[PDB]
Amino acid sequence: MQGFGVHAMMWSLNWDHESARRAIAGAADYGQDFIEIPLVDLPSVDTAHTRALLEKYGLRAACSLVLPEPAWASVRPEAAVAHLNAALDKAAEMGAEALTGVTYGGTSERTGFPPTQAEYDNLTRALSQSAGHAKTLGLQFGIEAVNRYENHLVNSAEQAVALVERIGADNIFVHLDTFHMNMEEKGIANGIIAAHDYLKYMHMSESDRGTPGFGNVAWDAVFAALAAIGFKGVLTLESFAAMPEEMAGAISTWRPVASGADEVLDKGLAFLRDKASQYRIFGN
Amino acid sequence: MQGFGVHAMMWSLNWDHESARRAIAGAADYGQDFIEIPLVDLPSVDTAHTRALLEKYGLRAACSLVLPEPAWASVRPEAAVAHLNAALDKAAEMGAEALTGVTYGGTSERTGFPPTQAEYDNLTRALSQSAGHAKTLGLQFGIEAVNRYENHLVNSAEQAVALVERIGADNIFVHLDTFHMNMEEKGIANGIIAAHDYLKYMHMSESDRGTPGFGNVAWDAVFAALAAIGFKGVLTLESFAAMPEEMAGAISTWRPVASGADEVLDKGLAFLRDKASQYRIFG
Amino acid sequence: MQGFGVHAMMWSLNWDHESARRAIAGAADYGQDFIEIPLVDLPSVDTAHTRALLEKYGLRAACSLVLPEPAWASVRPEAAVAHLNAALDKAAEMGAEALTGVTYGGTSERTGFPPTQAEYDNLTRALSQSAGHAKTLGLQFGIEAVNRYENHLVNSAEQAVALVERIGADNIFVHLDTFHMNMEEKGIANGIIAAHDYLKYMHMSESDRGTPGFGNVAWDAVFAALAAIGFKGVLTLESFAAMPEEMAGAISTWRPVASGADEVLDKGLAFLRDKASQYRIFG
Amino acid sequence: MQGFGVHAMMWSLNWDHESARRAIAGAADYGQDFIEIPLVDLPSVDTAHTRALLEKYGLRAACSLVLPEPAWASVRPEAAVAHLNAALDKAAEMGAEALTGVTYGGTSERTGFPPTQAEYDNLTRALSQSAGHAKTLGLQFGIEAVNRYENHLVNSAEQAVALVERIGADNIFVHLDTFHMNMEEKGIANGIIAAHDYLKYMHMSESDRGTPGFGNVAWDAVFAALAAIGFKGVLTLESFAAMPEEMAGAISTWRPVASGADEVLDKGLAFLRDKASQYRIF
Ligand SMILES: O=C(CO)[C@H](O)[C@H](O)[C@H](O)CO
């Protein structure tokens, strides 16, 4: 997987037949290599219609999700593997090449205590199976680190690497998010350096989830590190500029993050491409 | 209220006799003008002892707090006023010059929805009462903006200014935190600029709660904005480097933020001092 | 003088009749409020032609120059006054609102020694007289600070301010350039802050003279300081992307700075507008 | 060659017996692994005395110079080789492990035109010879890129790499300077990235030649790049804080760069060490 991506959330998080059409077609209009398709309601995902759309617009896909609470792997590793395998099935049916995101827990997950090795054993058992399942489908399996307020288990790139190395699969990659690294990494570039080998996917997101280029992410440190490690993965824009008011609680976002989705699509995607160009990402 | 401050959490969040002594003495060893004293359990605090130690060590103080959930002002405004007024009595008894922090709500406060006008009405009425009570004590009253994961009501400087202006009280000030602004402000310095009439207190906190100067906060933008708006208040280091493991759930902190408090104190307080001098803060 | 400007060097440094139309039309084409028109040798400039085009395309103008060595005010103040006064006449004729740039010396000027008081006296005498002439013509007079390798006299905003204060005119303003400030200012925002009473003109120039947004200028600190001090002048793009190889020695530019002027105009002018909006420079 | 260095200009560029003592003792007092010793007046240096002071305080050294104008390699390549080998002999006698700096030209060198192929042919010839002489001495040979106003020949990391590769020697490294990179590199970390194969030496220098961490150099981008490419050479602080006012012309510095050398050494070396630890450089 290599190139520029846009998260389907730039148009919607639904994936009914015309939500899929609007996001895929729009991602083709912005000349992206990949679209990131959220898997929220797995039953209501039409993989044949989606695959038809992807092939019509010449667009590759990766899938992402956050584990719902019944399926959090730190406490319920068996419902985790169930949910993760049923989402991998839908991702493979659809033509997507990977499942990534918060595949090990929730974005509202909290015990009140530090992570315990029992929790990590649960994560390791659950994730080694669903990754093994991903292998049979030819898929790669992503682990995205999020900030301390969303999850207590995988916050830094170092925790993500250590978890990957414990599972010991060969198709798991580390997925990092500049919105989360802006808090969790002691110098954002250290997260990219720490993940080095396993880093194949980036959420390129401004510090306020608005427009990359107009916030506090140190983008020159980010692209410097990405270039110097020889990154050949996907750079996917993630912004909450299109998120509906209905979604506020699920993303702890209580006010507008930007002026509107189309300005974020214009200025944000151009910014990532221009900055990729300045640092010769993919220039080898 | 002007100068360099350090939050007492660099030594402990506890405030019994021995922790009070250790925190105040520590602040004095690092030449600070202010110590920020947290008010967690008001009955367990010996204000006259604290007052005597502040004078012995020649230290000024600000108190700070987070409202416990029975007293969140957005839903329980009358309980908020009772808790804040008792907190202000203890602050005044200590000889503190202000009560600041999350004086309007919690740091685990969330409705699941955007803040409503009713919630802001409750906040407005409650804080007018307690700032009024603060005024009778000779104390200023601060509103600290915190990030979207801790509270849904006051996240950006603009929300803080707007609430301050709704209250209309002459002794309220905006209190900004670089850790929170690093997420909430569209360009951190825009927060300082938005708040320029009311900004009198800063938490200078690195983006990972570690050591200022060694993370993701754009300190030159912070210090330029502070200098250009003419800032005259207190610059208070806040770091989690001394926090005990038992605090983890309270501060949503799951792993060490730095090596130890002694290094954060040494390097972080010097970094703040050297940047202030570079940008001629305070002249 | 307020708004968004672009230097005519994005199309050519020659101001013959058709260079002027393609420069004025280009700046009009990119929505700019101002064009900055260079005055290299004054007899070459057809002022009647230019005022017509400025009227036609709805475009205001400022003129800029660098003193030629026979007229360096450091050493030859009366030659400087004659040169400045003649350029002021041409600027007034074509309807420019100001003459700015290195109006006090050269961009390859040095003595091998730090600037002396006698040198500043010569500078004061010349700029005093020529700023008076400019005042009679309704024109403001600008002094642009440049880095230590171009000139030994006016490098920091502080030096520019102190000179403007010496002269005591009311129509002299400080002109700063982010390319030179990136070297000269101890924290780029400190230059803007130092000039807050006099800053009416910016060259917004990337650290390598390329494209704003793609270099080492800390634009967040630049724009925050501009907003915080309430800047109301002109933000003018300076880039060398259109300079021909034959200008190399005059601008110490030995290799490409970008991939053509059109890209710099597209991305650089948009960047300055987008950042000015982020920090509410003009509303 | 690895560790933290300080340029002897922090105490003086005169290398008489007492100034060498003050400098080398100073760099020891600040716990440095290296001191960078400038070579300007060759007959005035006691190599035996310096080697002694180095070995006494357990300090490693690299030498640096700028070519005097009669020996600018671009136009006078035979004079350049003569001068470089002379400095190299002195460097090896001192116990230094490399000769670096503007070893190919001047800091006021200017033709009025962009660099020519003929000039680069001259550079390649003189540098390949003098690097050959360095190898027989057990020394490495450094090439420092400087900004467009001091030199028209080696300004970007990319030009330094191209030159190094055309010489084809084993013991030539690229040497960068954040003060010059802050003007020349399109994103300062791009210079470190482009020079990755050959970068063995840094001048860690603030944008105004003052105190590192208190100017415009994007230090997190610098250190990120250095960490990400696996840099394992020398980080040497360069600052004009100790320079006398009679040096102004040689360095085009017309006003103080900081309040004093002592605070630059105290704050700058501390800042570089703290950032090096933050990014796990060594
Ligand atoms: O950034 C994220 C939320 O913290 C993750 O990328 C989520 O998966 C996001 O909602 C996209 O699926």
Ligand SMILES: O=C(CO)[C@H](O)[C@H](O)[C@H](O)CO
């Ligand atoms: O930053 C903060 C938490 O969000 C607060 O300022 C402190 O933790 C608290 O208010 C101090 O009493």
Ligand SMILES: O=C(CO)[C@H](O)[C@H](O)[C@H](O)CO
């Ligand atoms: O930047 C400048 C000189 O270094 C000035 O703005 C000049 O006016 C510009 O180069 C055109 O002469």
Ligand SMILES: O=C(CO)[C@H](O)[C@H](O)[C@H](O)CO
């Ligand atoms: O940065 C430099 C001059 O521009 C070089 O490091 C000089 O050679 C310095 O004086 C070293 O001796």
Ligand SMILES: [Mg+2]
């Ligand atoms: Mg993400």
Ligand SMILES: [Mg+2]
């Ligand atoms: Mg705080």
Ligand SMILES: [Mg+2]
């Ligand atoms: Mg200029």
Ligand SMILES: [Mg+2]
């Ligand atoms: Mg150097």
